[PDB]
Amino acid sequence: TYKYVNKKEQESEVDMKSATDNAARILMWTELIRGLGMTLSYLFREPATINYPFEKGPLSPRFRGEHALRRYPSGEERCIACKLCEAICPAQAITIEAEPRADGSRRTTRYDIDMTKCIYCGFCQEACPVDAIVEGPNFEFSTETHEELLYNKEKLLNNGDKWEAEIAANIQADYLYR
Amino acid sequence: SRAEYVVTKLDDLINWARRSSLWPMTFGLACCAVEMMHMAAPRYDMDRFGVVFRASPRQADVMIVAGTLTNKMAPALRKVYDQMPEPRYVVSMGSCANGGGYYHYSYSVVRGCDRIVPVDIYVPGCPPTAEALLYGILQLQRKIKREQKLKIWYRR
Amino acid sequence: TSVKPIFSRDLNEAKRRVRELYRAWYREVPNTVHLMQLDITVKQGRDKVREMFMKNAHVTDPRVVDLLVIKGKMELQETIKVWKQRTHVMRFFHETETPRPKDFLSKFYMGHDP
Amino acid sequence: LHHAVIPHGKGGRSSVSGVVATVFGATGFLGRYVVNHLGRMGSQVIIPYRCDVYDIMHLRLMGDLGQLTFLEWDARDKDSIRKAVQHSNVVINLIGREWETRNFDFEDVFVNIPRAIAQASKEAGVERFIHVSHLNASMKSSSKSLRSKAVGEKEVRSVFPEAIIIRPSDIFGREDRFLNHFANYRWFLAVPLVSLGFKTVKQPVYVADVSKGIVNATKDPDAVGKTFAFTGPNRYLLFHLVKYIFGMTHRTFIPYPLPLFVYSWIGKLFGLSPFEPWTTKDKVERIHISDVMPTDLPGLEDLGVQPTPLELKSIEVLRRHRTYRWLSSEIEETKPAKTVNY
Amino acid sequence: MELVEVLKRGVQQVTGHGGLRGLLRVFFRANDIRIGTLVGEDKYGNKYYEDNKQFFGRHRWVIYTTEMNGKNTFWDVDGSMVPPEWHRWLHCMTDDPPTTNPPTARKFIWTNHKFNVSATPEQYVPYSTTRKKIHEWVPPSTPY
Amino acid sequence: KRPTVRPRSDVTHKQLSAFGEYVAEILPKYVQQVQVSCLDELEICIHPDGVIPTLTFLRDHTNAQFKSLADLTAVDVPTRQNRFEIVYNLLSLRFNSRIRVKTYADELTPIDSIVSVHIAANWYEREVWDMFGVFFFNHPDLRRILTDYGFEGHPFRKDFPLTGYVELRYDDEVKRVVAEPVELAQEFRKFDLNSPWEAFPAYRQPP
Amino acid sequence: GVQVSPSGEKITHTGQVYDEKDYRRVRFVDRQKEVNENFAIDLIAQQPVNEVEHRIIACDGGGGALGHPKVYINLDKETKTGTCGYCGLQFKQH
């Protein structure tokens, strides 16, 4: 079905009353006083803004931000260098170089993320079979140097040891959906 | 009391001025500019901080590279940065401009605005939440707050 | 053998168009060094024109020559107008690339390349 | 020869050369070209600075990720120099003012700071050291700058032999203090010249040639204990040089003579300036002493650089001063300068 | 009437932060006066107030400290100083603060949070986590 | 009836096969290999000389009012000597249907242009020339669109590298955005993903 | 295991440290290198063996869908013990 937006049904009915009304629309700007009144109404409403550093925007557990490399509750490193977080990374941001650890364990000697190539898509954390790399809540990690945004294993593990108290909760909230 | 202390407080004043009034440019290229608009929007209002846009680069104190920088649009960016009158600052916004981003390996992309303009502050994201761009702008304010120019001039 | 033409029955009728294009470029260079304030002399601009022409003198297929004429007319359009800036024009000169050494022993001193 | 020093790549950006270098006057007019030529082919460049971080931003670029490290220092504070040269092969000295200050004199710029850096470099164990004195630098001179540079050129050789001393003539570039200096004499309605500019000879060199020469000196197996005369070709005469400047810059030319003592007094009162002054007594002297014939020193051609003539590069720097009605005017409308051999 | 009641509410706002010192310390520092309920104080100084009669960007807010790790944040404040236990509640991923539903304790979790370090020392510098792959030949220290 | 698979009809297939016979027998001087797919998308393949007549036919014929150009693509297949498969997606708006006309080309066997039929083809022909190197006769402008002005190369050709042959950056020596050759700090990592097992016997190529 | 080298740099769990002559120590001037102090080798060594009764058991992390895939480990050997591939926990039977 369709409908017309600017098609007059039919014309040619005018008397002195309608002429007066149109001539008073003109010469008084009556359809402009309505815009003035609208903007005046908006002057007396509560503004939608927030004192940002002190009160902030609402986010959800699914929110995907800064990355982190997680650990088990035993402190054991949770990644195993299965090397598919970089298989699927559609920006080729992730590199891995892996070896046995001298304990006899599949673990990494390298986990880099050029966060200037990352598109923050979540594919790595929904591809990891062990919930090792995640995309956490921190969106406030701006820098004054390009080289700082090129991460490695130690920075990601620092993030994990920092944000575990948040990431564990976000995961607890969002699983049963993923 | 001391000339050095007077110089320090004067520099604090000039930094306060340039920090409480930094006028960015209407220069947005790609999706990241939408989050710049959202920062301009009511929730994260920029004019609250003295940060209002100006269209001409000569009436501007900062430029925000909110989008992907291509080989065809780099001369224009550099002309604009040049035409901006010093003191001037740059904010690279988004993965496409910090580095090459999701278009790093393509034939028509410069792999960072670092190669064309000198960046003061990098904001990551694809897109960066306007919350995050705002954090980066206040971080640039903090950077201006510690410039120590007249101090070093006195110490020349 | 037994192929279709484009704009050229033969190679001489293509060299005709080639010379028309060389002519347009020769007559355009003094205006391009003036309109957009290049920092070169008209002599070396026209030498660059002849260089980028003799970069393709080995060719004998008329069709390739016609396509090169077409692309030259495109670049001439872009240059007659100011669709392209000083950057693009001075791109031709390679004012920053060090000369590729055309000698064996230099290549051996730096790099595994032939 | 550490494996990280091996030169990989096709000689360009994102490659490696083995030229880990400190550039001390990096925040200036020549240091920017040196850093650009070092980063263009791939080489880490430590940049010690005292200026604000605002005045190192044009240097923040011109290098792939990591190949540009900045760190602050103080010439008064030793233990800020070993910090820099502890990790390098090469050390390049480009420090020098054109005027004294209440803090730093000429000795304390051209003698004591090179000597300090050279002691620190001989202790650290770097392989090369490029010093940059002047062509006219001699202990028997009229200018304090030149005599101080002679003293430093001698003392650096004493304390750090196996050094390299480059002696350029008056350099010209986009933000020089030579051609722009002559061109900025139009705000005053006439240009003074001692003896009308005659009996004074100038052999000026382009910046990029000096930079390429330094950048090859840090790679050539020769040039280990040797001086250099980075002069450029085409010895010009000062009157005709200024005339070429004022023809390229299409303004006018109203020259007139002026004795050295009154022009020196003018330089002094202009040097009473807390900011970067315009003219000074030593600048006047250095302008009005001829360039030495370099016929007994190697030069650029013995190091891998063809000197670019000033008639090829002058418009790039002097178009800034042209008015409308003359801005869109070409190099072939300036009747080039008469030369000399002497 | 109601004008008098809003004036009373403003009087309470003016007079619920201690005194003039305590009022200016919040007004010159956060540009707001709105009084709320103290949810809990952090182990650095942060306060984390709440007032659910407002709308869904202001029902929760922070009042930062004046010294976090020897940095003097009386003026230079940043959002990186909210630790993760309160980040989740402040960005409204929960209706459950850590004073009632705290997080799990772990030996490897950081005790002391760190704000953003970008220009300071003790910032981040990347490096190859790997090792030498192609080993060289060390010649002998004797001749012939 | 099966939920996971896509539903299937036959009336669209029959209609499009009928219309394919229609075009095939009405326009035999040009037409090759009419085909209709499992998904019912009619697809007529044409000699390059037949472009204007076929497109004018499908635009202006009464039982085929294909008077809207949706896409105009090209597809590089280096194997076949006539590389570039050129595609014309159309729709009718009178019969609520689409059709696809196809031709072929090469680096030196160009094609007549279509602005005399579909003005929408102007910028698409420009894009195709820029990306693949197919020249179009009697075109008004026929300059680049998408590539930089000083650009040598036809990027969407399969023999063109993804990263290109030139890279840009600003230089203080000359104060321009110079173009240096290409030198990446991280080579693109080509992944060999194709499995060594026949997944679809229906498309099995015999030797 | 954050023992240092004689060059003063911390050494990582991937024993990585730069040589003394390696010029790449510059980047840690007026700076430091991020290294994680909590090594997983020593930590998972600081974990006892979970004795069991059967010769074959399973291991997930402990959350179920929050750990790792279920794997079974044989415990017939007595001289040594079982070990999980994903985690590093150990098991034995009496």
Ligand SMILES: CCCCCCCCCCCCCCCCCC(=O)OC[C@H](COP(=O)(O)OCCN)OC(=O)CCCCCCCCCCCCCCCCC
């Ligand atoms: C005793 C017998 C004798 C008595 C003699 C007196 C007889 C009565 C005279 C009444 C005349 C009133 C003046 C009217 C002038 C305007 C004329 C007019 O027609 O409107 C002009 C313009 C036209 O609008 P349009 O719809 O396009 O119609 C034109 C078609 N030809 O419409 C516009 O101008 C609108 C564009 C301008 C918008 C600007 C924003 C206006 C905002 C309103 C603010 C009002 C505040 C005024 C306060 C003034 C205080 C000093």
Ligand SMILES: NC(=O)C1=CN([C@@H]2O[C@H](COP(=O)(O)OP(=O)(O)OC[C@H]3O[C@@H](n4cnc5c(N)ncnc54)[C@H](OP(=O)(O)O)[C@@H]3O)[C@@H](O)[C@H]2O)C=CC1
């Ligand atoms: N026309 C020319 O340029 C000529 C130059 N030369 C030689 O070239 C070299 C540099 O030339 P130019 O680049 O023009 O000099 P500039 O004045 O252009 O820059 C000099 C550098 O020295 C640094 N500097 C000066 N004084 C001090 C100090 N007291 N403590 C620390 N750093 C200091 C400055 O750093 P900041 O700005 O941070 O103080 C500045 O970057 C000098 O050796 C000079 O003799 C020789 C002949 C001609």
Ligand code: SF4
């Ligand atoms: S997918 Fe997970 S376990 Fe596999 S390499 Fe990536 S982070 Fe490690």
Ligand code: SF4
């Ligand atoms: S979020 Fe996406 S783009 Fe970013 S690292 Fe993970 S897979 Fe790569």
Ligand code: SF4
């Ligand atoms: S970084 Fe992401 S959001 Fe920003 S311009 Fe690039 S693709 Fe768009």
Ligand SMILES: [Zn+2]
């Ligand atoms: Zn397990």
